[PDB]
Amino acid sequence: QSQILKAEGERQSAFLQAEARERSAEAEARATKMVSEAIASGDIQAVNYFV
Amino acid sequence: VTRIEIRDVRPPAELISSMNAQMKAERTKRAYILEAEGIRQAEILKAEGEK
């Protein structure tokens, strides 16, 4: 019984982590679009300077 | 006509311990099982808490 209860715990944790993963992917997509536009407008030497 | 009776059958002191060890051992079994049941329920409850 103890093992079954534990396993249910990890199942619920996995569901919550999946939701968080989708949100983080959304944020990464928005960031990619914005920085892509900024780079495509002006130049590339500035990014090298920052790095 | 007697119906010959034995009024009493005494073993010595050494044999009495061996004879009543049987019933002492039969008593320990109940206690062991009850302790096992207690452990089982405690573990189930703690598992729920952890979940």
List keywords for this structure.
mainly alpha; part of a larger assembly; 2 chains; 90% helix
The helix fraction of chain A, in percent, is over 70%
Total beta-strand segments of chain A? 0
Q: What proportion of the residues of chain A form beta strands (DSSP E)?
A: under 5%
Multimeric status of the protein: part of a larger assembly
Q: Looking at the structure, what is the overall shape of chain A?
A: rod-shaped
Structural class of chain A: mainly alpha
Largest interface: A-B, 6 and 7 residues
Gyration radius of chain A, in Å: 20 Å
Number of helices of chain A: 2
Q: What's the main sheet of chain A like?
A: none
List SSEs of chain A in N-to-C order.
Answer: HH
Roughly how many Å apart are the termini of chain A? 54 Å
Subcellular location (chain A): Cell inner membrane
Protein name (chain A): Protein QmcA
Organism (chain A): Escherichia coli (strain K12)
Subunit structure (chain A): Forms oligomers. Probably interacts weakly with FtsH.
Please explain how this structure is put together.
It is classed as membrane protein. Keywords: complex, membrane protein. The structure is cut from a larger assembly and holds 2 copies of chain A (51 residues). With 51 residues, chain A is an all-alpha fold. Helix content of chain A is 90%, strand content 0%. Chain A has helices at residues 2-41, 45-50. The longest helix of chain A has 40 residues, at 2-41. Chains A and B meet through helix 1 of A and helix 1 of B.
